[PDB]
Design a protein around this motif. Structure first.
Motif, short mmCIF file in Angstrom:
data_model
loop_
_atom_site.label_atom_id
_atom_site.label_comp_id
_atom_site.label_asym_id
_atom_site.label_seq_id
_atom_site.Cartn_x
_atom_site.Cartn_y
_atom_site.Cartn_z
N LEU A 1 0.84 -1.19 0.00
CA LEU A 1 0.00 0.00 0.00
C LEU A 1 0.88 1.23 0.00
O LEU A 1 1.75 1.37 0.87
N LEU B 1 -6.73 5.74 -5.60
CA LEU B 1 -8.01 6.20 -5.03
C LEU B 1 -7.79 7.41 -4.13
O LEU B 1 -6.73 7.54 -3.50
N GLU C 1 -8.34 9.46 -0.84
CA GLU C 1 -8.62 9.18 0.55
C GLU C 1 -9.73 10.07 1.11
O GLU C 1 -10.39 9.70 2.08
N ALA D 1 -4.17 7.00 -2.41
CA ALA D 1 -3.57 5.72 -2.11
C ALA D 1 -3.55 4.82 -3.35
O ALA D 1 -4.33 5.02 -4.28
N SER E 1 -2.73 0.42 -4.25
CA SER E 1 -2.38 -0.90 -3.76
C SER E 1 -1.89 -1.78 -4.88
O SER E 1 -2.22 -1.53 -6.05
N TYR F 1 -11.31 2.28 2.87
CA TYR F 1 -10.83 2.26 1.49
C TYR F 1 -10.94 0.89 0.92
O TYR F 1 -10.52 -0.06 1.56
N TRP G 1 -8.83 -1.50 3.65
CA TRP G 1 -8.17 -1.09 4.88
C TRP G 1 -8.82 0.17 5.40
O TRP G 1 -9.57 0.83 4.69
#
Ligand SMILES: [Mg+2]
Ligand SMILES: [Mg+2]
Ligand SMILES: [Mg+2]
Lengths: 129, 88
Positions: free
Chosen positions: A31, A62, A64, A74, A76, B40, B62
């Motif tokens: 992440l 995305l 936050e 963020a 992932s 998220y 998360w």
């Protein structure tokens, strides 16, 4: 002015024993969080070599805070390997995030470090579950 | 075959931080976005392990909220009744 620019914090999350036991596979997750602008490149490195097999990274970061205009972001990614590959204590796994931020020219008077273009990484070593 | 599960993965540098990995579900499952802006949830991602001629779907969730758990992470989605939730 330029104080809305933030580099990513990066963390690697280790495969669960449950997954290893049930599937004989092991998924690592990386992440990258808290960055702005949303301009990063994420890559996986295994034993000092970049890997592409078994990797899936989100196509888009995305927000936050989706209401905010210059929300931080963020991203992932997952790397999935065999259970034996993850459990080998000789294997070193690294998630690398290249961030494109400020230059040396840019002025900066904030108390935090200057959010310059840089690489932020996180790592995990394989081990028995 | 599919083997839908939600696994808890711990941060390699601080064991109290985690993410929730919904994985190995079939391609008809829709992962919904989060309704709480403090939680998220990524889109479904298709991962290919060429070495084993194997493809699998996953999504990651998360949050910093103390009430977030792997059991409630994907609540907004319709997921399989046989989804495996290992005790942590
Ligand atoms: Mg290295
Ligand atoms: Mg549930
Ligand atoms: Mg549900």
């Amino acid at each position: 002015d330029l104080k809305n620019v933030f580099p990513p914090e990066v963390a690697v999350f280790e495969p669960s024993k449950a997954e290893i036991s049930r599937t004989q596979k092991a998924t690592l997750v990386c992440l990258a969080t808290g960055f702005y602008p949303p301009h990063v490149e994420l890559s996986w490195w295994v034993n000092g070599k970049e890997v592409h097999d078994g990797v899936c990274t989100d196509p888009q970061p995305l927000k936050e805070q989706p209401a905010l205009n210059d929300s931080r972001y963020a991203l992932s990614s997952r790397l999935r390997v065999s259970a034996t590959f993850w459990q080998d204590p000789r294997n070193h796994f690294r998630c690398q995030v290249q961030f494109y931020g400020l230059s040396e020219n840019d002025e900066w008077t904030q108390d935090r470090a200057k959010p310059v273009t840089q690489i932020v990484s996180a790592e995990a070593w394989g081990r028995a579950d | 075959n599919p083997d839908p599960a939600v696994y808890q993965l711990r941060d390699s540098k601080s064991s109290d931080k985690f993410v929730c990995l919904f994985t190995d579900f079939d391609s008809q499952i829709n992962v919904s976005q989060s309704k709480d802006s403090d939680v998220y949830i990524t889109d479904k991602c298709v991962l290919d392990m060429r070495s084993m001629d194997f493809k699998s779907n996953s999504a990651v969730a998360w949050s910093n909220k103390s009430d977030f758990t792997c059991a409630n992470a994907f609540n907004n989605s319709i997921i399989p009744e046989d989804t495996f939730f290992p005790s942590p």
